Each structure stands twice: as C-alpha cells, then as structure tokens.
Amino acid sequence: ELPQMVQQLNSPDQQELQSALRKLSQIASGGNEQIQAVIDAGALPALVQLLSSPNEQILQEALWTLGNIASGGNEQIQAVIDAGALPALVQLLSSPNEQILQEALWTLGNIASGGNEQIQAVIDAGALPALVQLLSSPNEQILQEALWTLGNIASGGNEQIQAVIDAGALPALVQLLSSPNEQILQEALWTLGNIASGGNEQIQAVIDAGALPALVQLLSSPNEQILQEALWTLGNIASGGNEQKQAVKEAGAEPALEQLQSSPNEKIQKEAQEALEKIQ
C-alpha cells in the first residue's frame, strides 16, 4: 500500500503530494519497524530531493520526516546519510527561515547521536563551521539547538571531539559560561563537558581556552543542576589524562616505544626516547 504514497511525491498535485507527505511523515513517527517500512519503499531519495522545494510547506514536511527517520536506529540514520541528506542539510543551515533552520539543526542533531561513523559523516559533510558560526546567534532557540547538536558530536571518539575543537568552538563555549540564561549556560556546560571527557590533548585545549576560572566560579551556583555539570566537567579535567596514560600503558605502549628506541630516523628516535622517559 506504501510505494503508492511514494510515487505520489512526484505528483503534479500539492494536495496529493502533501497527502502523501503528511501520511509518510506520521508513519515515520511510529518507531523502527515503521521507519524501515518507509525506508524499504524507497522514500529517502524523494524526501532528499524535496529539500530543494520552493514550497515551504513541502519543504518543512520533508525535513520533519527526515528528522524522524533519523531518530531511530543507527542503521536507519545510515540510510538517511546514504540517501545524500547531509549536503542538503548543511546548506539549509543558511536559511533566513528560522523555522527551516531549526528543523535542519534538529535533523543534524539526531543524525549526530548515531555511532561515531554517522558523527564522522556529519563532520565530513562540512557541518562544524556553520554550527560554530551559529554559536553567535542572538536567537536563543537556534543557539540552543546548535549547542545541542555540537554536544552530540562532542560525544563521539577523541578525533570527533578534536574536530569540534579544531573548528574553533571553545572560545564561544567559554563565554557562554557567563551567560545569565541558565538554559543556554547548561547546554554549553553540557557540550563543554563532552569535550573535557576526551583525552589529554582535548582536556588541554579546554584549559588553554580559559574554562577553569569560569568553572570554578560555577561551583558557587545555588543552582544544583549547573553546579553538578561544572563539578562533572572539572572531574573529567582532573581524571582524563592519567586515565588515558594508564590505558595506553595497557594497550601495548611500553613495548611499541622500546622497538622505536632504535629507529633509523633520528627525529623519531629522540621523540621515542623522550616518550618512553614519560611512560617511565
């Protein structure tokens, strides 16, 4: 009954087309067996292609359906990605249309709560620089949604976190730690906390950005939700490096570095000597 709804995404009519989209849009809302049902009927290419509709009613509906398909299994996120949604999503990040801009951020956020494979895709697709740009928005709804999306990215592996750092996000995050808007403060603390829970390098970048005095100050907050997030972030700062040191020691590092003691490249040699000195 359902590849019928699909072919009608191609329909000359807009009551028909939007009957179809409205239908497919609610079905996508009902959990993973239903999402896959939409997927297998081949809905993704149609829905991606409507991302360029000049009709905002078609556009926001398609956008909303992709976001919902993106809110299921990693495997279902991967299908959105495979359909080529990312490049389009990234362009919509420039919409002067606040409501389209928010739907696309939300969609990206959802994709970015996937595995590190789908986070890397979002990163490869060029999304970090627009997200960071948006950290300056005077619209607190877009700002919140951007912080969130960045938060999920910063919840991947260390290279994911490092991309976020390398895209320039930290100075903004640290200024928002002074914000008198508790909702924004807390989403920026949340994202910053994710950064702080990578390894040595990631922790160092947070420290070099001047987060610590701002975090120490938040420990006077009568707001226990913000106090808890400042303390959790601080405890990551204080633990991450030694825990990484010990995990590389566990992963084979002494041996590896001894073998390189005698490297024939001299620069690699001194550096390997230097690094064994450190894992003492």
Name which of residues 74 to 93 contact a copy of itself (CB under 8 A).
Answer: 74
- Of 206-235, binders to a copy of itself (CB under 8 A) are 207, 212-213, 215-216, 219-220, 222-228, 231-232, 234-235
Q: How far apart are CA 161 and CA 91, in angstroms?
A: 23
Distance CA 85, CA 93 (A): 13
Identify which of residues 20 and 77 has a Cβ nearer to Ca ion in the complex: 20
12: how many CB neighbours lie within 10 A of its CB?
A: 6
Does residue number 54 form part of the binding site for Ca ion (CB under 5 A)?
yes
Pick one of 83, 85, 102, 127: the residue that binds a copy of itself (CB under 8 A).
Answer: 102
Q: How far lies 118's CA from each of 16, 92, 237, in Å?
A: 33, 19, 27
List the single partner that 279 binds among Ca ion, a copy of itself, none, CB under 5 to 8 Å by kind.
a copy of itself
- Cα 266 from Cα 124, distance rounded (Å): 35
| Residue 96 interacting with Ca ion (CB under 5 A) | yes
Task: Confirm or reject binding of residue 138 to Ca ion (CB under 5 A).
Answer: yes
- Among candidate residues 115, 46, 48, the one with its CA nearest the CA of residue 78: 115
97 touches a copy of itself (CB under 8 A): yes
Name the region of 53 (left: φ>0; alpha: ψ -120 to 50; beta: rest). beta
Sites for Ca ion among residues 193-252 (CB under 5 A):
222
Burial class (CB in 10 A: 0-12, 13-18, 19+), 273: middle
Angle between helices 127-134 and 116-124 (to 10 degrees): 80
**180 contributes a contact to Ca ion by CB under 5 A:** yes
Which residue of 130, 134, 199, 209 would you call a contact of a copy of itself, by CB under 8 A?
Answer: 199
With CB under 8 A as the contact rule, the residue among 91, 116, 133, 175 that binds a copy of itself is: 116
Q: How many CA atoms lie within 13 A of 109 on its CB side?
A: 20
Segment 14 to 53, residues that bind Ca ion, using CB under 5 A: none
74 binds, among a copy of itself, Ca ion, none (CB under 5 to 8 A by kind): a copy of itself
Q: Is 146 in the site for a copy of itself (CB under 8 A)?
A: no
The distance of closest approach from Cβ of residue 155 to a copy of itself in the complex, given in angstroms and rounded to an integer, is 13
Please give the residue ranges that form the binding site for Ca ion (CB under 5 A). 54, 56, 96, 138, 180, 222
